[PDB]
Chain length 210, copies 3
């Protein structure tokens, strides 16, 4: 738990964390430490210092910036609130190759991976993930802790509910609203609104029941 | 109608205009004014000065560069001809993140959005839209006023007819020709030539009649 | 066969070569000559000097760097071995717009086109093609001489066998293994492992027999 001052604490030490670490370093930021539910190491050279019980120690030692690198959307949302309760500020991890329009509103704790484009007047909720190569056209609204998977695309005016997940290569046509907690499978093409809490797959995407 | 000299006039004041405005500003250009069929405001800080009846006034006051920011392909084509009749030059609106190969032939009034790649020896007709994240591989031929939607992709040697439209995430395999005025739905995967004036949807794309 | 010293020899003079030539020139490299099975010209200003029988002459004259610009995966693999037997080093042709993470392991003779992203801890075999706009998420393993077509995407932890081919816009969900010599059609969405030597198409991708 000997750290250098000033850097970013990461919650989570998986594959998603690797990619976030490399976005932060590409921006010139320093990653100080990881906390992981397996407290046993290092991720890309960043030390795993403990589990979430190490958060107060990290804060006391002067570290105050944090990113939640956990793919699971509800868990990420809960951990972001825990981190803020412990006095951390949630940074954004935006790869320098991402194109984020100057009229985009960004929340906090947002991941925006390499190759992303986000166009005019889009709003991006806290703790959203806009993954590698994803496209978000103008006037979209992305709720807190949703996840646009790699190579997915939203055409204009699409709203994505809190904690919704779009799989790799999913597509949404203009004006569509997708409910909270909804999953679009990989490659699904969404051509009408989706309610909350369903799973939709196919071209066109169709809701799959039990 | 008090303007600064030297900038670009925009026909259209919708969501597409927002994105074009931001491409032009990312290149260091100034947008002078919008003309919109609803002559009532501002779009991203650009004043709406009137409807298309204001074109001659704008030209007389020394403005001579124009972009047609209208998604509808036939309407865009008609408005580009009107603009040229009124003595405007049609500029291109190419986001600085777009990769346009040095052997690409570009027309005039072309939009090329953020994250696009256009490879060797492709030809891009006047008033085409190559939207956000779209890929155009080598040796493609894009007719005037066609529209490759966001995240769409053409493999090599594909020809797209005048005013054809490919929806978000559409794909075309090598060597395919798509007729004029044809629509490929979002996510459609085109594996054989399409004639003029049809609608094709699905993986693989199939023509949908009445 | 009068050449300038120091540049890259290209095997193949087709559409793929055009794109590779332009990646190399975008990096400031000089392309010295093409050898093509049709020994009859120039490709983008690069002289065709002969067929593969000209390799020893080229080496003797001091040229030692080579790229194999042949789309056919098995043929490319064979030609890369021939080139190395003749004393050439196989360079990589990585467009400057590609984002290649600093923990990616790259082989030799690899093409990485414009707009590609390759994330943390991915390994890319010799003579792989990562084509225009393709995305490779973290922890992927790409075998020698495979081809990820334009706008394709691998989510995390995907393994692609030697000489496998993914068509334009193909998608693979996390953790999937695709066998050697397997073809995924354009737009195919792979949701379970694929054995060697099959063809799979559709959303979801399904193996197509005779
Ligand atoms: C749709 C999904 C959520 C289903 O997971 P699951 O319910 O465990 O489903 P299974 O793998 O057991 O397959 C269920 C059935 O749906 C089909 N299926 C699975 N995923 C599909 C998809 N994306 N599109 C269409 N059909 C799909 C399967 O072929 C199977 O069909 P069957 O009835 O013929 O066997 C999942 O396959 C998916 O697409 N995940 C995306 C994950 C992702 O992209 N992650 C990126 C993280 S960065
Ligand atoms: C294909 C499209 C043009 C059809 O529009 P429409 O004819 O008004 O069709 P509807 O929304 O009434 O739906 C018609 C039927 O086709 C199906 N469908 C619609 N779009 C589909 C698509 N892209 N792929 C496959 N099926 C589709 C619907 O499920 C419906 O099926 P049903 O017979 O089971 O009800 C449209 O859905 C589309 O894909 N638009 C793309 C727009 C776009 O990407 N814009 C980006 C601008 S930058
Ligand atoms: C799948 C593929 C390999 C099949 O080639 P092929 O076996 O010669 O097939 P054909 O063109 O004769 O069509 C065979 C059948 O499969 C269907 N089909 C073809 N390609 C398909 C695809 N990608 N997805 C779903 N169905 C497809 C056809 O509609 C036809 O169906 P039918 O039985 O109703 O006629 C090919 O179409 C493909 O997708 N190629 C991708 C090439 C590419 O992306 N290259 C980029 C290089 S950089
Ligand atoms: C967006 C990505 O999300 C998922 O990636 P991921 O990195 O979140 O998932 P995994 O690789 O399983 O790693 C999650 C890591 O997160 C840790 N973890 C799991 N729960 C906790 C927790 O409560 N607190 C802390 N501090 N860490 C936790 C696990 O011990 C594990 O090391 C996967 O679904 C990927 O496919 C996807 N690309
Ligand atoms: C490429 C894009 O095309 C479409 O976007 P768009 O910006 O063209 O569409 P809208 O948002 O409806 O806006 C069109 C604007 O264009 C104006 N307009 C419509 N017709 C005219 C016209 O004849 N002359 C002028 N000067 N303006 C015209 C309308 O009054 C409206 O303000 C949509 O289909 C989008 O989903 C798509 N991304
Ligand atoms: C990745 C790309 O692969 C394929 O492109 P390609 O450039 O390899 O294919 P083609 O345009 O037919 O050109 C292949 C060139 O490669 C030459 N060639 C074919 N065989 C040989 C060879 O053994 N030695 C040499 N030196 N050259 C060979 C042919 O004479 C021809 O000029 C196509 O499938 C494209 O659609 C795809 N984008
Ligand atoms: Cl660091
Ligand atoms: Cl301006
Ligand atoms: Cl050169
Ligand atoms: Na892209």
């Amino acid at each position: 738990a000997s750290l250098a001052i000033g850097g970013v604490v990461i919650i989570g030490g998986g594959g998603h964390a690797k990619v976030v670490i490399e976005s932060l370093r590409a921006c010139g930021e320093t990653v100080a430490a990881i906390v992981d539910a397996d407290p046993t190491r290092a991720v890309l050279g960043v030390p795993v210092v403990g589990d979430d019980l190490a958060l107060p120690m990290l804060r006391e030692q002067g570290l105050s910036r944090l990113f939640v690198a956990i793919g699971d959307n509800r868990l990420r949302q809960k951990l972001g609130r825990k981190a803020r309760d412990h006095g951390f500020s949630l940074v954004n991890a935006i790869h320098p190759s991402a194109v984020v329009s100057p009229s985009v509103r960004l929340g906090e704790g947002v991941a925006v991976m390499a190759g992303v484009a986000i166009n005019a007047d889009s709003w991006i909720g806290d703790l959203a993930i806009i993954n590698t190569g994803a496209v978000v056209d103008a006037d979209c609204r992305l709720g807190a802790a949703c996840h646009l998977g790699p190579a997915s695309a939203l055409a204009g005016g699409v709203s994505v509910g809190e904690r919704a997940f779009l799989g790799v290569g999913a597509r949404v046509i203009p004006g569509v609203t997708i409910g909270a907690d909804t999953i679009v499978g990989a490659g699904g093409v969404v051509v009408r609104d989706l309610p909350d809490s369903v799973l939709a797959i196919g071209v066109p995407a169709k809701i799959k029941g039990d």
